[PDB]
Amino acid sequence: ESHALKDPWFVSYIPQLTTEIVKNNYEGDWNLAKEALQQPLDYVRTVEEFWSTLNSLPKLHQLESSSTFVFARNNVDASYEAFPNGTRIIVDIRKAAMAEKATAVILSSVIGESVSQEVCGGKPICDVLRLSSRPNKESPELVRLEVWLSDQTYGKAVLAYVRKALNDVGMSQPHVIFGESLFEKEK
Ligand SMILES: [Ca+2]
Numbered sequence: 010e011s012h013a014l015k016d017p018w019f020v021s022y023i024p025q026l027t028t029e030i031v032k033n034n035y036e037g038d039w040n041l042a043k044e045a046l047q048q049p050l051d052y053v054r055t056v057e058e059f060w061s062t063l064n065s066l067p068k069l070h071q072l073e074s075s076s077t078f079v080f081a082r083n084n085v086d087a088s089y090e091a092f093p094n095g096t097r098i099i100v101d102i103r104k105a106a107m108a109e110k111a112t113a114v115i116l117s118s119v120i121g122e123s124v125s126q127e128v129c130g131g132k133p134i135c136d137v138l139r140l141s142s143r144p145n146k147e148s149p150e151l152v153r154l155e156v157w158l159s160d161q162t163y164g165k166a167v168l169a170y171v172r173k174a175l176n177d178v179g180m181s182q183p184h185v186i187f188g189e190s191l192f193e194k195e196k
């Protein structure tokens with residue numbers, strides 16, 4: 010007795026890219042780069058499949074992979090340009106011993122529709138989730154989680170909800186950092 014997800018999520022991994030590499034090889038189109046370079050993992054359709062696929066991922070906090078893992082609702086295009094008026098919520102997890110649980114909390118909150126129900130009036134707004142290793146000199150095991158929203162007017166409220174969710178299960182500054190980045194600004 011599987012439990013269906015509200016929507017299926019297409020899960021893949023992509024190599025690390027840069028604006029210049031995408032400009033020079035993929036006509037500036039990050040979605041084309043993704044289509045050209047991704048490897049599929051699964052199209053998750055049930056709660057059980059979600060957990061199976063998540064548990065199969067590399068330990069990004071142990072530098073097992075340089076790839077970005079993407080979860081895309083209904084296989085939506087995962088480029089900024091496919092999110093007009095959108096924003097990204099960034100969650101940086103500095104503490105390696107918290108990365109797996111933070112990832113589980115954030116991904117399950119969205120894929121299980123808690124964010125939609127509790128923040129967005131039941132409308133699907135969070136349509137892409139990304140997960141990457143992003144070490145820096147201050148934080149050599151940093152994992153970066155991104156939540157991409159189709160409508161920037163929900164950004165502050167989604168951030169607050171996800172922050173509270175993490176705080177409630179033991180994860181707060183300085184172990185995790187939150188930010189928001191409008192797609193129109195970044196572009
Ligand atoms: Ca296509």
Ligand SMILES: [Cl-]
Nearest residue numbers: 172180181182
């Ligand atoms: Cl915090």
Ligand SMILES: [Mg+2]
Nearest residue numbers: 051052053058
């Ligand atoms: Mg499958």
